[PDB]
Symmetry: C3
Subunit: 458 residues, 3 copies
Amino acid sequence: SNFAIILAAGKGTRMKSDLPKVLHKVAGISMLEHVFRSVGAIQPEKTVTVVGHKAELVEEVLAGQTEFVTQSEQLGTGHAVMMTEPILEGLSGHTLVIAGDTPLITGESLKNLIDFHINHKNVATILTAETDNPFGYGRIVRNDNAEVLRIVEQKDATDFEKQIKEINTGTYVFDNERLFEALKNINTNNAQGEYYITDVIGIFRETGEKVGAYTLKDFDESLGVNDRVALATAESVMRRRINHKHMVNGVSFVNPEATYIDIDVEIAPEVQIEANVILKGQTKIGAETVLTNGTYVVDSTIGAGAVITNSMIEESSVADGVTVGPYAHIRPNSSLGAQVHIGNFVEVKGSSIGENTKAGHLTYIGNCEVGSNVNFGAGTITVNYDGKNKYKTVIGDNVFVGSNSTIIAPVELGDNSLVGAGSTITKDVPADAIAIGRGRQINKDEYATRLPHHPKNQ
Amino acid sequence: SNFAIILAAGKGTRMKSDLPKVLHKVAGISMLEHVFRSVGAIQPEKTVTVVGHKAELVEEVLAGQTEFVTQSEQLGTGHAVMMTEPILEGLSGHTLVIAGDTPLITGESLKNLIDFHINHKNVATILTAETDNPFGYGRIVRNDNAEVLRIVEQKDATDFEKQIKEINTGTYVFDNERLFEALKNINTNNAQGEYYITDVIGIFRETGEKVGAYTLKDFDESLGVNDRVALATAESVMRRRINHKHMVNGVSFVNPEATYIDIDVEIAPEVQIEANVILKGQTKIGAETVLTNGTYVVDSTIGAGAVITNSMIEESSVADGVTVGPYAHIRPNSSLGAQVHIGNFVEVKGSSIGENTKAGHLTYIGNCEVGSNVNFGAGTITVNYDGKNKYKTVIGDNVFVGSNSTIIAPVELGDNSLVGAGSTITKDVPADAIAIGRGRQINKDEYATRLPHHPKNQ
Amino acid sequence: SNFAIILAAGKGTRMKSDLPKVLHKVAGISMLEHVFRSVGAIQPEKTVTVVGHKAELVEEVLAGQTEFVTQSEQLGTGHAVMMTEPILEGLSGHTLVIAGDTPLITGESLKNLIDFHINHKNVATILTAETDNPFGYGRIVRNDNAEVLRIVEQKDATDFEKQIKEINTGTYVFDNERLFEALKNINTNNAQGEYYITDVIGIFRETGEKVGAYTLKDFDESLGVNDRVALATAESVMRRRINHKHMVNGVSFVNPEATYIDIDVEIAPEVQIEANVILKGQTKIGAETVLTNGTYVVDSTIGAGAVITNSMIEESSVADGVTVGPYAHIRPNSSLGAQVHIGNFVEVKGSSIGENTKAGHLTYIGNCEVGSNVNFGAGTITVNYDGKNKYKTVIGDNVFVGSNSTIIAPVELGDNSLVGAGSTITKDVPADAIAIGRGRQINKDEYATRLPHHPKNQ
Ligand SMILES: CC(=O)SCCNC(=O)CCNC(=O)[C@H](O)C(C)(C)COP(=O)(O)OP(=O)(O)OC[C@H]1O[C@@H](n2cnc3c(N)ncnc32)[C@H](O)[C@@H]1OP(=O)(O)O
Ligand SMILES: CC(=O)SCCNC(=O)CCNC(=O)[C@H](O)C(C)(C)COP(=O)(O)OP(=O)(O)OC[C@H]1O[C@@H](n2cnc3c(N)ncnc32)[C@H](O)[C@@H]1OP(=O)(O)O
Ligand SMILES: CC(=O)SCCNC(=O)CCNC(=O)[C@H](O)C(C)(C)COP(=O)(O)OP(=O)(O)OC[C@H]1O[C@@H](n2cnc3c(N)ncnc32)[C@H](O)[C@@H]1OP(=O)(O)O
Ligand SMILES: [Ca+2]
Ligand SMILES: [Ca+2]
Ligand SMILES: [Ca+2]
Ligand SMILES: [Ca+2]
């Protein structure tokens, strides 16, 4: 009943990239993927994506729910659609034709397109829009009774026709039956090589079959991306849309025009986001937590009541009430327990940290299983690499790891123990003990008067 | 002679917050507080704020110069004003009626509103504005001679009336006498429960008493905040206004559209601010200092000629010529003396630092009284916590604190002394002495050929 | 044949700066310098800049290709041009008159101005533009046949004339001969002190000599900067222009409206720039490298395939495939070899680092010649200062510098050697050896039950 054809073979030369045009990301996912999301809104019985060069790459990535045909030669949009013939020829119903480079179009607009089509039982329906600078776009010609007669390109347009402000977005709905029919009719009697999807509209004009146009109230929603300038504009519209949705859902933004949140990030209500925060991938933020300017989060989970201050968190888990930063880096596979505190210049990598534990400064915790109520003094380092292998360090509950100490794994610091500040630990420390591995202080009276820094020597 | 009534009881359901709508901040202070600031511009003999739910909270915070009446039930704006009757009934004069959720209105606009009122000796004056999308707003109906006849809501508006572009901002000036009179007249003969402030305009129409409207030249100044989307817009307008004011006052902004400066921050002329800088609360910046992208300052004082590079400064004092950052954190109750230098990855907490002293890297200084011309080598740590209590460290003038040393308080390093790099200091170091607490170096020939990192073993 | 006169003596009082108005920067260089760049587009046989106060300063800086005359008194634009008389009087040809405070005008617009001039063989040509708020600007009066009759200031304009939307940008092309002629004719018979460049247009009106106006299609291109508000606007237009140019050239921007790239930065295609990145001065970025939010680069070279994560790089060289950050600081005169890795909280100053070497954390490397495949454990510090002099450290290939070690220069760590974590190195370490300078660990059973942090004591 409903079928979809997505054109993704284009030659994105103005992109100046080796990556197939439609694979370029917009807020987390590729333009193609956004098109797949709006397309799904019309519940197409079949979905066929036409890819061109590097065809393998596009497929090798998003093998999403969609058939895949290849267009080895650049013979135009008509030929691209013709490549879906083997799969859609014969079937009766409505077929959506959309480009993979117009990611701003919405599922809602696509639904209205079909409804508008089936409604007037048109043979073909053109998704159109209006602008005051239609230069370059095919124009939409209608009769005094406002019926879509045909589409006129800029090069063929009469002076009088250049005045038309309604343009063709390049998105269409065709009755699948007539469509492939008209595609062979143009292909064979073409007296030329390349044919275009708009050539089918020319045929319906020759035969008088009903063709209509649904207009998009927002012209900017029809943007076709051809270069990194339109790319940025796409990014900008999608950003406003994502952020508008969160604000309506109860999230505060100091500046939603400069906050970068990917398409799939989930944010509980009452969260507060300062300007210039970055949320990427599969990220979740719980209720009332606070994200300050600079925070950067990727594929992570943050609980409720947390305060993330200018810090970078990657593939990690952060419980409720956790405070992080400023300038902290939480690396892959880390888990911070409830009320944990990670202060400035602290790095946590592949480590579980129990609740209420704190590492407030200039610290590195890697490959450690850390307990609850632990204390890391400023300067502490967990050494877990010898140039070939990594080793694990186990730290019990309530351990007091003295400042500037060097913990050389594999070792265990038992519960309630303490490592003297400035110590190098090479062996296990039993529970309730203290470990000290540092030289004893020695004073040399008057010796400083004999060194470069002394006032007497400058 | 002049009285003010501020409506702050509203049910901000679209805000999706537990915090009373008007308490949500906009550039440092709550919307209510901005309204109190514009209201003060008309020197009201009395100011009464009507609060609703959580009434205690709004009051418990800004017990600012203003009477407080409570509206326990949601019976409309008319009933809310009726709650101020005990306090304003009888008094003669002009009474301003304003919402606590329209924080962009200015004191200047409010003054022009009253003057326009007293001028034409109107009984009531409507603060209006113009827009091309008046859908939803009450319209302002005037006669062929441009006199305000009445206000018409959207639901009652005739097709012909929907065309009116002048809308009601919900701000008004009433002759206090007639106002409460008309409020009882509607209340009793209401034949309904809730009555609205606009019902009083209906009565003056019935009686023919003169009603006028002062139009705001800037429509965006009338924004009523109902959700976090308008919240963000408020933040955006107020930000442009604050920043415009500083630029006119001689401050350079690389991008004033993305620089966040609270309402009360003071900035001397010739200061240079890069994009994405944050100034909050009671912050002061002296002449010619430079703030680079990322700098974040809260309730602090910075002198003239300073250079703050991507650093966070909180509740502290920073003298003239000080250089901080990149990535430095100056925490509560710190004071940096003239020409002091705090470099990358350095934390200073509750400490006074004398002039020309330097801590250029990976350093923590907490609870210290530090002298002038001191030098902290990279890696230094002042240890001031044992898990229960904090201790103080006193460091004289010209001390050279060697890199990677660990200073365990409570201790004193006397003038011109030096602590050997990599030392753990547990006792006082007399003036002019040197202290060393580190193991002596030992070399083991060929031993490395026997370890994982060696080329021979990989 | 073509001559240029740049007016740079103005009294930029609304700037509130001690620095001559035209010296204020816009995207890396001064407004004056941007004007010199557009001016060069018309290949002027001679270029003369009129400077006023602090005349020495403007010259003492950009002694660029241009004659320099001084205007000691503020007698108007006419007098300023009159100061170029000694140098341009007599010569025949077209003379461009432009202000040093209109930096957005383009060389292309300037070329079109001259062509439009020489074309109609006009005596004088006025560079004009159109806007809907011409209040304050001199208006352009034309006859029913659209010929430039004269310029009318706002104060003299008739009501009917205030309607004119075409305004004078203050940029002109005059036939050098008549120009100085008309300048003496006004100067002597002036019956007043100060004369203005627009007075020459008045004379051509008296004599009927042909005067024309070339209109700028973009009004915003004519901005005259007088205060830091227009300054910011200039910065904003120039930023969009620079960034538009890179996007067209194949560079991706997450938000080109909030990315700050100086006028002279070079960026290879396929580079990806996140929002809020800063590129200043002579900076070069190679193909496909990635710059994340916060990165700040000044006068540096970055190769291809690099990933710079929220880090600051100054006057340094960075090879291909290098990864830096987050929160790393690469200081002046550093060179990172191919595939080098500098992680979080690491500082590199005046040091060469060989390929594949890594310093992933909390590390300071200053004044070192470091080899290839070296490894710096977290916490390492190279000590190179004694309060008076700096010393160099030489580190061979494949050295393993243990965590928390303190390397006191001048020393050498030979190839494949290893420094034990937590060691203080005061002497050379031969190749293939290991060096250890740390106290041995000692455990005291039960001692912790006797300290403040222990659960038993709280
Ligand atoms: C900067 C921040 O983040 S702040 C929070 C971090 N806080 C910290 O890191 C503080 C940690 N505190 C320390 O390291 C302290 O120096 C402590 C807790 C080890 C001092 O403990 P004390 O028991 O009071 O010191 P004391 O000198 O008596 O030493 C205890 C035992 O160890 C021995 N000892 C002391 N120093 C050494 C040493 N360098 N080598 C070997 N043994 C030593 C003593 O001989 C004594 O043993 P004994 O009883 O058999 O004679
Ligand atoms: C990374 C940056 O920010 S850079 C700037 C920071 N700069 C620094 O931190 C540099 C600090 N410098 C140091 O620590 C040096 O090693 C210094 C200044 C202590 C070296 O001083 P020197 O006097 O030249 O060394 P020297 O070996 O002679 O030692 C002096 C005395 O201490 C003794 N001593 C040396 N090492 C030790 C030790 N580990 N334990 C006990 N005593 C020691 C010596 O026996 C000698 O005493 P004596 O005269 O009674 O025999
Ligand atoms: C946090 C990160 O970035 S992770 C990556 C960084 N990784 C690191 O920094 C790890 C570095 N590793 C170390 O420092 C380790 O403690 C190592 C490599 C020195 C341990 O080496 P090992 O040889 O296994 O230890 P071992 O105890 O046998 O000591 C070797 C020799 O030094 C001696 N020695 C050990 N400790 C000391 C000491 N404190 N003082 C003097 N000599 C010592 C031993 O007596 C022995 O000599 P001998 O053979 O003549 O008796
Ligand atoms: Ca297109
Ligand atoms: Ca409202
Ligand atoms: Ca250290
Ligand atoms: Ca001007």
